[PDB]
Design a protein around this ligand. Structure first.
Ligand code: HEM
Ligand code: HEM
Ligand SMILES: N=C(NCCC[C@H](N)C(=O)N[C@@H](CCN)C(N)=O)N[N+](=O)[O-]
Ligand SMILES: N=C(NCCC[C@H](N)C(=O)N[C@@H](CCN)C(N)=O)N[N+](=O)[O-]
Ligand SMILES: C[C@H](O)[C@H](O)[C@H]1CNc2nc(N)[nH]c(=O)c2N1
Ligand SMILES: C[C@H](O)[C@H](O)[C@H]1CNc2nc(N)[nH]c(=O)c2N1
Ligand SMILES: OC[C@@H](O)[C@@H](O)[C@H](O)[C@H](O)CO
Ligand SMILES: OC[C@@H](O)[C@@H](O)[C@H](O)[C@H](O)CO
Ligand SMILES: [Zn+2]
Lengths: 411, 407
């Protein structure tokens, strides 16, 4: 089959054939679309075909499909599965697998960078202290004093499901959130529950508005352990505005390294439950969502007051005006401190070029419009005008339940 | 079976059962989502009519009544005999209001029950169509205090006698390709404009020429008519702080009136059913004025504001965008012409959604279209999960007539 997508601004039409390789379900049906829904131990039986599909993809990528090396590897893996019920990936396969999970992430607008991922193999890790050391090294490497480099650290794969490795933090670096008895929230509201867990586990909370959370690490299914990331490895940027000198006095700042640490990486049927990865920020993530969501730092009112905007009626678009200035401040601050960041115009323009290239060399590029289009100025970015097809390819990054809802405590 | 939608800002979860009544397809499958794609017999008729009538009689608390059963048999007899049937005025009004109620891409549905329905099923000629349209425009415009309305022309018979309004909206500006290779006017209307000239219209070749109506009756060739100039309310655009804005010489019409969709009620198809409400600010300021394929005025405005257009990161496009939109809202409000900003419109849709889940068990909604084209996440709909599905009565897309008409 062939499916076409059209760009309504340029009339350019692209043809997709890659969707035929899609196996996983989307959540939609011929009668209902769930395109805006955020969240719509295997057996030997189901494992070898997953392994085979992957190795076939890998060997084709290196132009050795059907070779003796390819056939020997399939045989080697088949024998390993029947013998041990699982199998180990070669270093080359792990790297190829991690890169493709990113290439296949339909919600990621930064995929033009997919082939440049630095992969850290942490499959020899056995304890939480070992995980801490690997993570510190990841943060230092990725941060690179402001010249950010994309990277992923991969811990041991799932075995029987009772020995999982997990990073309990949602991101390696985040700010604590504290619920006050008067019902107000200090810090980042998004992390109140995790913050409470850390405190219960023994963390001594400084109780400020921007406290870097400690790492809570679980190795081999054991109870998680607390570790503080060396302060000198956590790069932060004070936010100020190029024309408004009062902006700095809002006391805002943000960390430079965005590092998702709670997703699961699937490669050839194998499940990597601890696979923290990082790239660099697109400005709106901080300026629009982290600072302006009503449920996050919610700074729109304070900023609009300072700009002395007419806040008597929404039709003056005071919220829209303040939003633009806040985002100008974020980009200006990061750039001033020489910390990598990309604005939404540059990022979306690059994604469109990446998408077109993928359709041509790969036959498609699964993309989730709802997530790709920036949270501000949507229609003045090219992606708003681009029809997209969303489907799931493996290797892939998947959501998994927070560990505190499933962990069997040992005491 | 029972689906749930969550609002990530408030945590409120709603349960949807209404989708179970969905009949038409979405274009998606379990393997691929096409959520961002813009355009994804007597034996057939009676089933559709029954489905509709059952919902109508249920709405009037007379389901399973004798009147319900009588009407059901009356229509059945009529279909078998005439291969079609005629809706009672009450059914037509209910159907039209529900087609709006079911429009998943419309953010202004909290207004659905207040639609004024003009029954033009007795219309027979193109001149008759012109008169009905002039009356709709005058009524809906109401000197600036707009009122929602729909005018319904004769239903499809055999497909060779279809009534059609060739225009995409009752009121739009012409588009002309110039020697410069550039485009004068609205680029979106270049093809239709040429069809009008090809038909006789004397184009004024200006930037904002109100197009004439091309009306088709009983399947005959379409005819041109000029909407009385005095019935077309326009608003000159100026900014409340930038005196130079008025120098851009921009203006827009006050009445948005989609005229090319097909209204389906109880299996019957009404190919000419122009309807109108009022504008959401972003429609004009973001899309019409800033789309690169439309008036594309961002650069001009940025220049007048003296913004640094060297680097995209200065967010000059974003700053100019907000100003253009502040000007549109200010101009309409200053002239007492109805208009709603995206914050107010989206807040009302969320309230409408809650009402609908509580009293109907759901509300089909297309997130891709409901979320405004600017400041997405500072509006509540961005944080609202939605389920998109098709219910009838409905408003459907249909091929432009010039690509199907046999002259
Ligand atoms: C190099 C710079 C990168 C940029 C500019 C970028 C940008 C983005 C942005 C803007 C989002 C949306 C975030 C949100 O709204 O929560 C995102 C999502 C995502 N990115 Fe990227 N990304 C980059 C690197 C990476 C890397 C290194 C990986 C993996 C190896 C990756 C995997 C993903 C995934 C899986 C999602 C969706 C997560 C979810 O569903 O919550 N990205 N990216
Ligand atoms: C009363 C005020 C109304 C408001 C504020 C409103 C607003 C909107 C907006 C902003 C859109 C998107 C337009 C676009 O991006 O092209 C829209 C779409 C739509 N509206 Fe409403 N609307 C109103 C009344 C109506 C009425 C009276 C009807 C029908 C009787 C209606 C039927 C629809 C339909 C079918 C669509 C989607 C059209 C498409 O798919 O292209 N609307 N509306
Ligand atoms: N730019 C990035 N942004 C990551 C954004 C993560 C986002 N702040 C977040 O909280 N994501 C949720 C997922 C929400 N669906 C999580 N990680 O638990 N990633 N990067 O590698 O460069
Ligand atoms: N506010 C309204 N806006 C509708 C605007 C229609 C839009 N400008 C338009 O051109 N739609 C195309 C379809 C868009 N894919 C058409 N009807 O030919 N509607 N109203 O009744 O109040
Ligand atoms: C309900 C809706 O799906 C939700 O708010 C989505 C919309 N688009 C998004 N897009 C990005 N990049 N990130 C998000 O968290 C979201 N949230
Ligand atoms: C390609 C994409 O579907 C297209 O640009 C859509 C997105 N959302 C939209 N939303 C509204 N209200 N109106 C539109 O014309 C569009 N265009
Ligand atoms: O406070 C805990 C939250 O950070 C956590 O529940 C996240 O919402 C979850 O990881 C999904 O992002
Ligand atoms: O110039 C003709 C166009 O306006 C017309 O073909 C529209 O694109 C069509 O009605 C869909 O909006
Ligand atoms: Zn879908």
């Amino acid at each position: 089959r062939f499916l076409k997508v059209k760009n309504w601004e340029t009339d350019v039409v692209l043809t997709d054939t890659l969707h035929l390789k899609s196996t996983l379900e989307t959540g939609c049906t011929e009668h209902i679309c769930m395109g805006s829904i955020v969240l719509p131990v295997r057996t030997k039986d189901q494992l070898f075909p997953l392994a085979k599909e992957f190795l076939d993809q890998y060997y084709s990528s290196i132009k050795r499909f059907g070779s003796k090396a390819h056939m020997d590897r399939l045989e080697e893996v088949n024998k390993e599965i029947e013998s041990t019920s699982t199998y180990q990936l070669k270093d080359t396969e792990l790297i190829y697998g991690a890169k493709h999970a990113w290439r296949n992430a339909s919600r990621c607008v930064g995929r033009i960078q997919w082939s440049k991922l630095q992969v850290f193999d942490a499959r020899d890790c056995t304890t939480a202290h070992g995980m801490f050391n690997y993570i510190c090294n990841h943060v230092k490497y990725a941060t690179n004093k402001g010249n950010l480099r994309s990277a992923i650290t991969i811990f041991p794969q799932r075995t029987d499901g009772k020995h999982d490795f997990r990073v309990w933090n949602s991101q390696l670096i985040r700010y604590a959130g504290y619920k006050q008895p008067d019902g107000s929230t200090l810090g980042d509201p998004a992390n109140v529950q995790f913050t409470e867990i850390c405190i219960q586990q023994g963390w001594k909370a400084p109780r400020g508005r921007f406290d870097v959370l400690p790492l809570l690490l679980q190795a081999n299914g054991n109870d998680p352990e607390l570790f503080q990331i060396p302060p000198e490895l956590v790069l932060e940027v004070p936010i100020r505005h190029p024309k408004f000198d009062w902006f700095k006095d809002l006391g805002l700042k943000w960390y430079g390294l965005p590092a998702v640490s709670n997703m699961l990486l699937e490669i050839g049927g194998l499940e990597f439950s601890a696979c923290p990865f990082s790239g660099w920020y697109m400005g709106t993530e901080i300026g629009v969502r982290n600072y302006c969501d009503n449920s996050r730092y919610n700074i729109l009112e304070e900023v609009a007051k300072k700009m002395d905007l007419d806040m008597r009626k929404t039709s003056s678009l005071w919220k829209d005006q303040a939003l633009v200035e806040i985002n100008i401040a974020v980009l200006y601050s990061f750039q001033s401190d020489k910390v990598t960041i990309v604005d939404h115009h540059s990022a979306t323009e690059s994604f469109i070029k990446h998408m077109e290239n993928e359709y041509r060399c790969r036959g498609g590029c699964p993309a989730d419009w709802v997530w790709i289009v920036p949270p501000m100025s949507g229609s003045i970015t090219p992606v708003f005008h681009q029809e997209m097809l969303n489907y799931r390819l493996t290797p892939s990054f998947e959501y998994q339940p927070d560990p505190w809802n499933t962990h069997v405590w040992k005491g």
